[PDB]
Amino acid sequence: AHKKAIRRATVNTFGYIAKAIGPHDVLATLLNNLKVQERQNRVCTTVAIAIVAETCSPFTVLPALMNEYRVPELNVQNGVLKSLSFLFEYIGEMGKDYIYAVTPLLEDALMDRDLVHRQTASAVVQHMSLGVYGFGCEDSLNHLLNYVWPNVFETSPHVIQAVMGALEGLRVAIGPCRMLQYCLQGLFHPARKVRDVYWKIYNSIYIGSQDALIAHYPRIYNDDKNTYIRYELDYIL
Amino acid sequence: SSESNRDRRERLRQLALETIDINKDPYFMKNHLGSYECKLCLTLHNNEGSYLAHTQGKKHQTNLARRAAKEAKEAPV
Amino acid sequence: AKHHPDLIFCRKQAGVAIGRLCEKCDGKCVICDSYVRPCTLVRICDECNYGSYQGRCVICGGPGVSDAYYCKECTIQEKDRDGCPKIVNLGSSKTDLFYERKKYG
Amino acid sequence: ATVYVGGLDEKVSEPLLWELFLQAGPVVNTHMPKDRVTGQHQGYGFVEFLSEEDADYAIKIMNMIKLYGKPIRVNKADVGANIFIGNLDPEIDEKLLYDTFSAFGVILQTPKIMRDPDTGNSKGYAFINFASFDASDAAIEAMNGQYLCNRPITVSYAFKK
Amino acid sequence: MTDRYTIHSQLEHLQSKYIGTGHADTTKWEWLVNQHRDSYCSYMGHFDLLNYFAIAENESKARVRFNLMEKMLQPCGPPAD
Amino acid sequence: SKKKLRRMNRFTVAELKQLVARPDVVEMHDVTAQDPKLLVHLKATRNSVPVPRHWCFKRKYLQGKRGIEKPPFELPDFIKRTGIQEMREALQEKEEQIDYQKLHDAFFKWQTKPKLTIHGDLYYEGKEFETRLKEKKPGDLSDELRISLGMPVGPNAHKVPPPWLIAMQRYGPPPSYPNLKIPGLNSPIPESCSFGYHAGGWGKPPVDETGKPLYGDVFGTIDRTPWGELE
Amino acid sequence: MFLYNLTLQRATGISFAIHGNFSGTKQQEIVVSRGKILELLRPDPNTGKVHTLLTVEVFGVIRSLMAFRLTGGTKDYIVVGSDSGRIVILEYQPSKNMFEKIHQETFGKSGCRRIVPGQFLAVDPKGRAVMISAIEKQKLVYILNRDAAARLTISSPLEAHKANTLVYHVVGVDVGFENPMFACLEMDYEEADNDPTGEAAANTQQTLTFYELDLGLNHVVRKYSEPLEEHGNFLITVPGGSDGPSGVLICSENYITYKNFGDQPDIRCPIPRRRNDLDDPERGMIFVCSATHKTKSMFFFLAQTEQGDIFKITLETDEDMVTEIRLKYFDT
Amino acid sequence: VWRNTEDEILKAAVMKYGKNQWSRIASLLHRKSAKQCKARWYEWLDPSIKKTEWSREEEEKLLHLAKLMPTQWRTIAPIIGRTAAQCLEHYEFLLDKAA
RNA sequence: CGCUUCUCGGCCUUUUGGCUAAGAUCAAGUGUAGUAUCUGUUCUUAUCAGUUUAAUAUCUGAUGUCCUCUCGAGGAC
């Protein structure tokens, strides 16, 4: 239906009947969507799967999804990645339980040849990190950030913008000390494509959390005609 | 819409799985994502139509010819 | 919004007048362009609430029918502190669709 | 200080070779040159160690290591010249046997100590098939009548089976 | 060309909107001086770092605050050219 | 002329390694920076993470990776305990012509974390096939190495003789590694091991004529509780 | 390991203090802001002991705090400018014993930032307008008006941004029901940034500049700027309108200067020094805190100097023009 | 018009299915009709279409015929073994180089 | 032992029930933004100088002095 209210209501009803009966029957039919006419959508089916997994707790569906990730067809691999994205955005705080499960998947996406898998995997990390804010699951977010970082040199606007979003999510979830350590060596690189990318990232940080960044800057030695070291910070008591 | 489209795509795919077998085509591979790869050229092809059109190319043919001459010279009471 | 990068926001000082959305657009966050977890209300620039524009859909430009909210994310990263998000460019999409309309029927 | 690794079992990974050489010395260059067509090992490889004594030590310590069970020949990168030996010691094995007997030449075959079937001890004899008649001759020349570990060694060209 | 000058306008405007961001030709001097000046505003903010300095030296918090705000003018020596 | 003026004053890689306190840190391209000194100093700080390697590679990132075939993603073993692999296969196969307590326990009762790289682990093309090296540790072994030797793998490997332990006891341990202790050669035979010549013997302890070991010791002659733990 | 954090005795050092009739009745109480705890004391009038009427935790750094009270109102509110993004107005309900949050208006991101306001807070004596200012580049003004039910109401923010300008202290000037003026010490580092020699670091003296609301046109204009002789660190309002002249006292290193706009000339004094001190002679002397006492008859200020000597400052005036300033020692 | 991809799919489809069910074939590619497939195959694709330049004798025959049987190209083109399109344009070309 | 024919065992090939009117029949949404892949097509110039780049590249420009042979050549320099 070329209208949106229709599709909306459709998805919500899919949630309702899932509650009526039980996730497995509806999830199996929803997964059978390779539905070539990609957007205009199988995307809305992705949303539907998310609501399914949400309304009846995702114990049930997450194995089914992680299974489907094997079927070698493209649009369905990407379907499962999107559905993950929405899943984490919707359930929010509960990801503290499934993040350990999910990562080795996302690892697998972030390390492969094509931009659609990397752009959609980066959306996932954004939402996931925003949901896990403050619960102590940082080691795995840090590992996912290590795979995400190298795409930072890229061109297609959709992937470059998905990556930047992911990076600021990870900023709130890892801290800015981390993003700063990642962002240092290239603030002053000899290139200029990199210096562009790095100063864009470092601004997007500095705008947020420009206060937290105080206790994080590296110590920089002073030269002959200036004084670059802050001594008030090591007044020892 | 989807039932006929799915049948259409499936029929096309089976169609040059049969044609690739009939031309005993070595440099053919289907990858895990269902796209078509030329192992001789390291090129990805989306459709079965795209893959057959790639086989008639200055790229494919020159790679086939270079692979050819090199192979021939490269053998030994 | 995150979908047409050719769009612009007012970006002056927020005020005290709440923001409203058309029935068409309603149900979403203005920036993260999602559809969930509304947390906090929108506030708009004094100009962007002056004049006939009392009660207009920030995005669609149409009639105010409900309040406009901020997703949990945007309020967690504090993207909700950039003043009027009122979009001061109409955008190509509405123009072109109306024009093709007038052509066809 | 480069090492010839021949007889390497087709399934042995050059990674596994460098892995065994990790405990063995300064593993500097592991390279299993292979037929670029079939991909599997070409039965030859070159492993250069940074130190010459470590290279020779790996050659002398990795001797006959059973690669996929098959003894691979690691050293620097059957013509009827086999010695047989009488008065062989029962506590000697092929390891020390070839280790000392390598002096007169490279050994073409595994030194077989004549051992009986029931308990498994030596019947008092050994043999090994060297490379050349000169090698078997210098072996039987330094090793005949002389004292082996606890039994006075006896070396003569082996009787053909 | 177009990239350089539109990103240049965007960086000059984003910077004049946020004091202290950077752009691909930011020099060591401007980086370091913006970074001092922020340290200073933050010492005067956090009610406590003020106590730390006002005990490490033996001055009183009013005199300490005054010296900080004196320095915020040119903290890392005079400019470089 | 100004570009040329900076070029004229530009440093060599040797000069940049020279004045700078740390010279390795210094790459061939750092000489092209605006400030060589600040850049090397920033690459010489602790915990920083170096720029990804493919900035200069003329070719694309994972586009260059391309051509070889990859096996489909392998499920975490605890999801694999549910068997949803089998249920999906059966339904799919019928079309081609599960209980809930196990799933809840699989997610909570028996789900465990994977192996994850700490901060500074960048991904690069080949890191999944990069050969883990540097492991100069003689004690570490494999199961593929043990089996392809014909040596036992698993908990008995310690009593399963490495075929070069007899050459360790014969020429000394590998001479490049004096620091090598071999159990049953320079440390005692492991628990329940027996020196001997039968199938599975540890040889004879390396010995001098007064009764002391020439290599190691062939016979083997705080309060670490954590603070706040759950009960 | 999982941890749970409690306190045992709350903070007890005091960083700001204001005094009002916060509970509505003639008895007058103190609000003190500890670091991140805000608590209201009241000193019992006969015996003099002080009681901690209430202490609440605010989980946020309190950077400034002011009392203020509408025209003819009999309560006093509490403006609090935190490190958050928001200005908030509180009021102490004596009945239920708790601070109620009458108002909260957001204007920027959170944390002790450089250009996001909150540090300096000023109010105009007759209660009409509060201004909240950063340390650089941003100042806001809100107007507060009683509604129908005479409950409080807050305007939308006005704006006074001005690039490259530090601000050493902001204070409202007292005028009777005219345009409100705020008089903020300043300094302009912009050219000192581009003096490769190092001159404009010196020979750049700070300029006192009266901003001014404009009730008619509803904005905020810089009315008068004027250089100061030497750097001063804070301002004391001088009760204007009917009682006393108007104007501000500047308390700069070694001097104190009345200086008001109009035609009033500037008036100075050097700060009286300890008879035969031991201090290192070079170290100057400044005023740390200060406190106005104002009675239906008179007014006088107390100001305290670095070593801890109070001084009772008074102003001798000719009906509208102040002629002389007179300090005498008080105590230590 | 036709693109080489549609062209190849046509080759394969024909050699599999035989020349008689054009409905199935045209069902395969999108934006292609059975009538068009039939036409294209018999016109250009089919191997029997001889693709070379005109002999002198072939042009003699062509010219002579198109003089004998005005404007009947679907009558001529079998007699010289090319399509109506070939005969047509090529006769145009001879006529233009003459004048 | 040589020849020839036949019997069998080990087995490396194709292998839908037909007639009828080729039984009959034979679907594509639209727009706006951006990326990817194929097919296609093309650089041998020598310096120098410049531009530009992280570095190439690119792009820009010109081909020691005198005579003469036909960018080459000989000699007095």
Ligand SMILES: [Zn+2]
């Ligand atoms: Zn949002």
Ligand SMILES: [Zn+2]
């Ligand atoms: Zn506005």
Ligand SMILES: [Zn+2]
């Ligand atoms: Zn709308």
